[PDB]
Amino acid sequence: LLELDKWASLWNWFDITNWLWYIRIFIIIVGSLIGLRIVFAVLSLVNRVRQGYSPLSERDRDRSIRLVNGSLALIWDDLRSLSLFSYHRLRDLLLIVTRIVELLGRRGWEALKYWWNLLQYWSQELKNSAVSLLNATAIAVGEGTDRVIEVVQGASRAIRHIPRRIRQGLERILL
Amino acid sequence: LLELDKWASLWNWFDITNWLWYIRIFIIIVGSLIGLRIVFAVLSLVNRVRQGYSPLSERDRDRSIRLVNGSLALIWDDLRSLSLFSYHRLRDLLLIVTRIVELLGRRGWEALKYWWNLLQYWSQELKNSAVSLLNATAIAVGEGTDRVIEVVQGASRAIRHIPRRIRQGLERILL
Amino acid sequence: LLELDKWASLWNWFDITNWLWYIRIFIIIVGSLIGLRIVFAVLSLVNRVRQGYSPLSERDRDRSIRLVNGSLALIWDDLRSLSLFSYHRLRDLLLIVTRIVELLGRRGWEALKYWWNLLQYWSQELKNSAVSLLNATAIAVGEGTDRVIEVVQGASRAIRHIPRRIRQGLERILL
């Protein structure tokens, strides 16, 4: 079972054996390929020129070939970004990066403002559909029971419809 | 063939073994890395901004940094896309998404429309190269070949392609 | 140390072993998973309109569904690049590729050009940092530390400037 007997018998599949023993080599390239894909993001820019910014629904090839030559241009877009229109700035510029992240931690709360309001309107639509069927089916009974289904539904969503400024209050208490 | 003592022999390689029994676990992590790439698609947007306009041929680092601001923005793009117009749309979105495909699928056949055209012109381009060369070598024998060479080649392409509206006749005749 | 008896015992653990003996297959599936990922690059095109102009910080979602129709449209962006509207170009398309690369290949070397000036100023920022800090600390002492430090540092680095434009000599002398 297994061992030299299983491994040795495989040497007859010389072609496949190569893949079986050299796969480990291949795994590294596969992991590398996702990283290579990061460079592929530039390719979408090429796709934009070829297909147009709007959905996929001519001249681009001649210029697109310039992408090969893009190696020369490629130092131009990136070169001015790190040091900007001034020198001595290059060492100082990396520190700027910390500045936006510190400032953004304060305004980042916009996550919660929309999520509470967003879930709030969806719930309202659920109640509206239910109000239609519930109001209509309640009449079969009588005694104005349908009026009861409307008030209860309207009471819970409506009261929760307009809450307090949790983003503002929490923004000042968090920083 | 493999070996038993080789497995134990690797223990004497100081720490080479560390690569084998760690990279293997590391592979599962790589699988996670691919699912990481979907967010990278937003990076391509930043790239077109940082790339000027055309394929590959400064301040954009600070603005691209604004990509971090995408957290607050993220509820906004999803919010108008998910329901879009009015507000009874969120449940409707499941209906309209399915329903649009049927309406849109009808015009989608235009794929074939151009493909019919691809074969149509290349056929014509073949005639120009072939007729020119064959027309010239044909006369080398005498006088009378020029009519058969031009009439036979031009005749086959000429009668094989003339009617238009391929999808119009094809898509409707299927009823 | 090891033995086929140790491996066989693991067969009674019919659960995890599948991963252990199918991970080789798993990376291949992952490879396919990542190639599939490339289509996401078009999503960025949609992101511009659907997700806003700049990075992450309209109605076209209806158009996002038209992406299905993108098969119809997809021949329009591509068909014009190989053959172009001029036509007769299609056989030319294979030849032109050599001409544009041959033509652009001569001036394409300017990549090296930017690197020479680019690195040149970077050396200059480092030079200013050392002189300012070292001279300023040396000023604490009298005698004449200020004159020697600023003159010798600035004299050696500044005078070391030598214009050896490779591109210049490559354009005029390579003919």
Dump the DSSP string for C91-160: HHHHHHHHHHHHHHHHHTTHHHHHHHHHHHHHHHHHHHHHHHHHHHHHTTS-TTHHHHHHHHHHHHHHHT
* A60 has a chain C CB within 8 A of its CB: yes
The candidate with the shortest Cα–Cα distance to B148, out of B158, B160, B134, is B134
Amino acid identity at A164: R
DSSP A11: G
The C-alpha R_g of chain A, in whole angstroms, comes to: 32
Dump the DSSP string for B15-81: TTHHHHHHHHHHHHHHHHHHHHHHHHHHHHHHHHHHT-SSS---THHHHHHGGGGHHHHHHHHHHHH
Amino acid identity at B74: L
Rounded to whole angstroms, what are the CA distances from B140 to A174, B95, B131, B132, B134? 94, 71, 15, 14, 10
Q: Are A42 and B41 in contact (CB under 8 A)?
A: no
* B54 has a chain C CB within 8 A of its CB: no
Cα distance between residue B43 and residue B66, in whole Å: 11
The candidate with the shortest Cα–Cα distance to B59, out of B68, B71, B50, is B50
User: What are C160's two structure tokens?
Assistant: 């070391």
User: What are B86's two structure tokens?
Assistant: 């009015």
Sign of torsion over alpha carbons C162, C168, C172, C175 = positive
* B73 has a chain C CB within 8 A of its CB: yes
Q: What kind and span of H or E run contains C19?
A: helix C16-37
Distant-in-sequence, close-in-space partners of C109: CB < 8 Å, separation ≥ 6: A72, C166, C167, C170
Q: Are C84 and A44 in contact (CB under 8 A)?
A: no
Provide the residue count of chain A.
175
Distant-in-sequence, close-in-space partners of C35: CB < 8 Å, separation ≥ 6: none
Place of tokens 């001279």: C135
DSSP B85: S
Contacts of B80 in chain C (CB under 8 A): 58
Cα distance between residue C71 and residue C56, in whole Å: 27
Tell me how the structure was determined: NMR
Which residue pairs, CB below 8 angstroms and at least 24 apart, start in B129-136?
Answer: B129/C91
Considering only CB atoms, C50 lies closest to which of B77, B107, B124, namely: B77
Amino acid identity at A171: E
Cα distance between residue B46 and residue A81, in whole Å: 13
Cα distance between residue C133 and residue C13, in whole Å: 67
Tell me how crowded residue B51 is: count the other CB atoms within 10 A of its CB.
Answer: 22
Q: C51 by DSSP, 3-state: which?
A: coil
CA angle C80, C82, C85 (to 5 degrees): 40
User: What are A83's two structure tokens?
Assistant: 């040091």
Compute the CA torsion angle B6, B9, B15, B17 (nearest 10 deg). 20
Cα distance between residue C66 and residue B110, in whole Å: 13
Q: C166 by DSSP, 3-state: which?
A: helix
Cα distance between residue A131 and residue A155, in whole Å: 12
DSSP A110: H
Rounded to whole angstroms, what are the CA distances from A158 to A71, A122, B93? 60, 13, 24
* A22 has a chain B CB within 8 A of its CB: no
Amino acid identity at C94: L
Place of tokens 């960025």: C44
Contact B100 C54 (CB under 8 A): no
Rounded to whole angstroms, what are the CA distances from A114 to A111, B80, C84? 6, 12, 48
Region for residue C154 given its phi and psi (left: phi exceeds 0; alpha: psi -120 to 50; beta: otherwise): alpha
Cα distance between residue C131 and residue A175, in whole Å: 41
Q: What is the 3-state secondary structure (H, E, C) of chain A?
A: CCHHHHHHHHHHHHHHHHHHHHHHHHHHHHHHHHHHHHHHHHHHHHHHHHHCCCCCCCCHHHHHHHHHHHHHHHHHHHHHHHHCCCCCHHHHHHHHHHHHHHHHHHHCCHHHHHHHHHHHHHHHHHHHHHHHHHHHHHCCCCCCHHHHHHHHHHHHHHHHHCCCCHHHHHHHHHC
